[PDB]
Amino acid sequence: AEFKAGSAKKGATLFKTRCLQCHTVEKGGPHKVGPNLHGIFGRHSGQAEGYSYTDANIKKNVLWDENNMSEYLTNPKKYIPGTKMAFGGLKKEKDRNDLITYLKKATE
Ligand code: HEC
Ligand code: NA
Numbered sequence: 001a002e003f004k005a006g007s008a009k010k011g012a013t014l015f016k017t018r019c020l021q022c023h024t025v026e027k028g029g030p031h032k033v034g035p036n037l038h039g040i041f042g043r044h045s046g047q048a049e050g051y052s053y054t055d056a057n058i059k060k061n062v063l064w065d066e067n068n069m070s071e072y073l074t075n076p077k078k079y080i081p082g083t084k085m086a087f088g089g090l091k092k093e094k095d096r097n098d099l100i101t102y103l104k105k106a107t108e
Helices: 008-018 055-060 066-074 093-106
Strands: none
Touching (some): 066 093
16 A cells, blocks of 8 residues: 555544544553554554454564555455454545544554
């Protein structure tokens, strides 16, 4: 994937309607179904403390960045076979861009 900066505000609404049910983003926000995502960019997958990950997510051992995030969110289970993240994917490129733009800022 090739991330391009988009709308953080549209990204916030996307995140809040599609991800918030399972994830928080703020520093010190709780793990829910999925892990809190603060600091996710520039951290390896499966390394948020206090969250019980699948072996598949840990073994993937991907250094999260803007580009591999876009790929992941397109089809999570395709990028990380075995993941328990039950999200079909964001198929529109503009949506992933908007979401990732938000995500970069919100996870600081
Ligand atoms: C539950 C119904 C979820 C929804 C909706 C979304 N996510 Fe998720 N995500 C969920 C789980 C259970 C997990 C852990 C998967 C595992 O196999 O252990 C995840 C994982 C992620 C990750 C990776 C986190 C890491 O520390 O490596 C990211 C980056 C992530 N999820 C982001 C994300 C976004 C942006 C969502 C909506 C667009 C989203 N998730 C939805 C559970 C669920
Ligand atoms: Na709860």
